[PDB]
Amino acid sequence: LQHHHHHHHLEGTVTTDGADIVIKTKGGLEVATTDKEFSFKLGGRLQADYSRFDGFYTKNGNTADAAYFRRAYIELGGTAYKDWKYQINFDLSHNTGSSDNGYFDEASVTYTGFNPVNLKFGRFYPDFGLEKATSSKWVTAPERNAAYELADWINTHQDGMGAQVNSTLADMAYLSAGVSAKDADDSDGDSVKQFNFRGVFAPMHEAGNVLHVGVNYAYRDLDDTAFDSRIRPRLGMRGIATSGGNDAGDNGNRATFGGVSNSPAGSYKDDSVWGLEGAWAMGPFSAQAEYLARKLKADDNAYKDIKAKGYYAQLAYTLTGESRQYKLEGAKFDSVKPENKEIGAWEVFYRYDNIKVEDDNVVADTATREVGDTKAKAHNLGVNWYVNDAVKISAAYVKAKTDKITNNNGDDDGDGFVTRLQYVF
């Protein structure tokens, strides 16, 4: 019994009521006013991993596997009133952040009105190290290096909040400094506070022409705070223990090289790390390396200091000739953009990692760990196929060798293979 008069509707046009808008899609969406006042970008990244691995990587030394998303970010960011930016990256694979506090890769607000100086607030990784500054989309090896695993608090947000100032300097350098509160309380409920500094001199800072040297410093205050002091490196093999899908389960060997899961309040106070970075690129050839040293300083006399030192060096070469992109803002490498659309770009890489842990609190042998300094060396050799700007397929061989620590089989080395399908939008 419902009825209505019919209408002739205007069709086909797309307009706006404010400033002219430009819209773009490469699989996601970008919308922006041409006066630069407002913008919105929806994107993301999918990293689908399959790996198999044995020896030291597993407890009994037999072959385990893993089938998981390393990352599955949805990424929302935008600009309002020209100078105010936000970026919210949440990880559907649940590898980043937590159930309690949100699965954030990033949730930040940045004021850019003092360009080149930026002021950044919210939940975001502190700036320590070149490989960490580099987007996880474009890190050359499948996982970041083992030296960071000696003190991963230096460049993770740990479910807290921070404030950072950063700037490029005269088109030849980049500096950042920040303070953060991390999610661990002392006996009064006051969070661990942390300071970071990073400074890079990069007189050459473009794709295929990079010369880069930098320094990093991180400090945190653990006064009267119970915390996990364990150093537990995965040595390039994420699948030994990971969220986002299937892993090695009870047979994964993510081993404790030093420290303990529950260091009591009052056991430690000062924790500091110094780092160096260096990078060079000429056309398709690049070399980069980082070194860091940690001192976790005991407070109570019953406890001894824990020290650790580590480094990596990486060679990479684009067989098809393209350069790795480089950005002075953030002093970081970025993507490879394929020149040949029919075969894509093909990149080979080798990274060597070396770490040492000195924990004088270990005074007795266990079944798998000998008194003294524990050590590991890792080799990561692989290929990245950039099919196009959106899709990257990778395969890598990973090998590790240890000293004064084994798995239950007595293995002092292990190896594995990892394959990844990545889609960026």
Next chain:
Amino acid sequence: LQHHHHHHHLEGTVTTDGADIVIKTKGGLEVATTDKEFSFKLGGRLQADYSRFDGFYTKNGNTADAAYFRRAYIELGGTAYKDWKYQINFDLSHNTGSSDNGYFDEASVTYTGFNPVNLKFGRFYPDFGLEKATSSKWVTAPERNAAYELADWINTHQDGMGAQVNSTLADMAYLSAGVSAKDADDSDGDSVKQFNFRGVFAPMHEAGNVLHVGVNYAYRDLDDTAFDSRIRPRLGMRGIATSGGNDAGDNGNRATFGGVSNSPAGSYKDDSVWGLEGAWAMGPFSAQAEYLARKLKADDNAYKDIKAKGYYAQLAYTLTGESRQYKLEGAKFDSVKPENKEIGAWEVFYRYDNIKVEDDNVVADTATREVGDTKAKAHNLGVNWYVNDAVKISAAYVKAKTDKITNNNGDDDGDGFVTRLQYVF
């Protein structure tokens, strides 16, 4: 060996195959047909908090802190076939909703064909109270009032489902009524059912010209249902216990003023709350207040009724002269839109809260709680800087004073400071 013929592609235009579309961005995205048949809006809100607090707010009285996102909503909403709307707001900070049932601020469908009458279905807060009706983007104080904390079931969805009818009445009033199922079962697995009514007379209902009086009623049936009867107010300080980041941990004092965590099935049945609201605004000056009273009625003779009464009153003044927006649809205040683009808008506020809990089931002193009526008063004094329509920076001082309840230090008062950076898109 792959090859193909080259093409000349048409570039630059943006069109549609249906009715004309208008697109907008202020940091998010809106897309809508001009015939009002279809629309889509992607937005959200980030609320980044840092606070420090002591006295009654902590167990030992020493200073704790908190560094967390109060809310981090992603907001998707749209219209189809003119009269059918959806709204899905999910909270990445995990402060709203749950791991079991979804982190929903809202997941609703609304039929608007009977305009001004709306029919709303799904998971959404029942309509009780002016400050609750007001968007959490634009609530003047950093947290909502303590009177609601006496019975927070009246205007939370508790992971259930509901149906609501609402309407404005002759451009002078607003009414709503709803039924909901809440996520708690009786011994047969049948959910707690709840009824809400709200009615407001607002003959003046525009920004800078408001006169508003209203009544609220809520009822729920707890027959044969085990439930948490605790009244545990945070008294303006979210950081004593919160998700979305770091809080006061084991030293936070979110104290139980009355009730118990596990009231057995059969202990209570009727639970009802009556409320009043009043608001007035003239230009940049506004005053608002609410009062409510709860009776939780015992069923089994071993149990005594629990009663509670509370109110708040708030003064607010925009120093820079702008009015608080007001909407008759929902009978609620909304944002401040800054007039001066160089300095933004500056707002000062004071809210006073007063609550009383009468629990005759408490018959013996504990170390921190005395037999009789427990009471609290709170004062919230602060500044909101609306930098622009998207960004609001706040700072507030909060003080509380209690009667017949203390922390472990014997403190009967406490205070703290909270700062927030908010970004809306």
Next chain:
Amino acid sequence: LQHHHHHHHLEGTVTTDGADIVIKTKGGLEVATTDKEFSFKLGGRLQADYSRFDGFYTKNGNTADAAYFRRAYIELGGTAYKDWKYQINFDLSHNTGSSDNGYFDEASVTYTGFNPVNLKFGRFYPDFGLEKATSSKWVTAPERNAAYELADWINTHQDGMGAQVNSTLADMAYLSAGVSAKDADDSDGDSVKQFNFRGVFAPMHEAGNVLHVGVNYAYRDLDDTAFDSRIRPRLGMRGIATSGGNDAGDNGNRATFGGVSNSPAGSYKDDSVWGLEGAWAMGPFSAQAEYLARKLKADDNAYKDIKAKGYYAQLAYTLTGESRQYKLEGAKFDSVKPENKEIGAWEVFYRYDNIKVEDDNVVADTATREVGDTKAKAHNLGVNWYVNDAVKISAAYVKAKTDKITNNNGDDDGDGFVTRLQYVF
């Protein structure tokens, strides 16, 4: 003291810097280049359920209820460089996927360059069965059939990863085959591997003209793997036990018809399922049916094989005359598109389910389960109102009858009613 020169800004136009773009909205958003190289689609589905049920569906036989979202998907998908697609569907109701590994309905990458052959990778349901292939938006009954509940591993992703090849064949058939790793490890940490095949002959494959016969096969290797072998059908009543809101709680009877929650490593190895499908449609009338049989083969001599057999048959008729859509790609039914905009489309359906479980490991009676074959029959009778393309409102009556298993009241049958409000965008 801040000041600036004023500007005249160009307003109103919407353009792009690349190939021409077409944008669309029906409540969500689609953006695509006209050369088919790039596209993006944001959509989703909300399924709001309320049900009441008693008898066998509850433990004591009294009436329970449920008020929950069955699904609340946000759906992001797109195309890049013509031949590379992604699809990421995450479920805000937390009914799909997990807290540990992500709430994915789907997270996949598809290469389509070998059209009609597709290559699909990531986390997605293996292809077994017509009703499972059919979108959950458009499955006719409120829940899928009970035969699938006899072996739900055959067409669920179980938080793992997979690779699938599929193709239509000469506009008369459809085939798919895939391998997957499922999230359960043997004692070495190696995941359960699974193979699927599906093949359908559908010489008539359009809306209102369907003739469809198909075969399914699934196999998994459980060697040295501890696993949950329970068969626990909900028999059409989701609310007896569900996430996404309120359910029957401790009085829900999702009963174990066979198998055990912790079958030890070494107890079983081969697990295989064969299935048949058939479908026919002429205008508004459709008939479909599936049959499957499972053999879970014991490894260790202490264990006996577990077998199960089940089928369903469904009649459906659109009273208002419209056809159910059908797609050869995926060999599946899809939506009903209403022809009359004032009253929508009205569909009646009846589905009959029949299952039998043979578990010779059950050698003693329990209080509710008798030695021998357990059986259930279910009847699902209901109405779907397609208000418009976006909104579907459903109501259904469900009845079940069991053999050799009861609830605690001794009930051998039960019934219930389910209502759903669905919004697709």
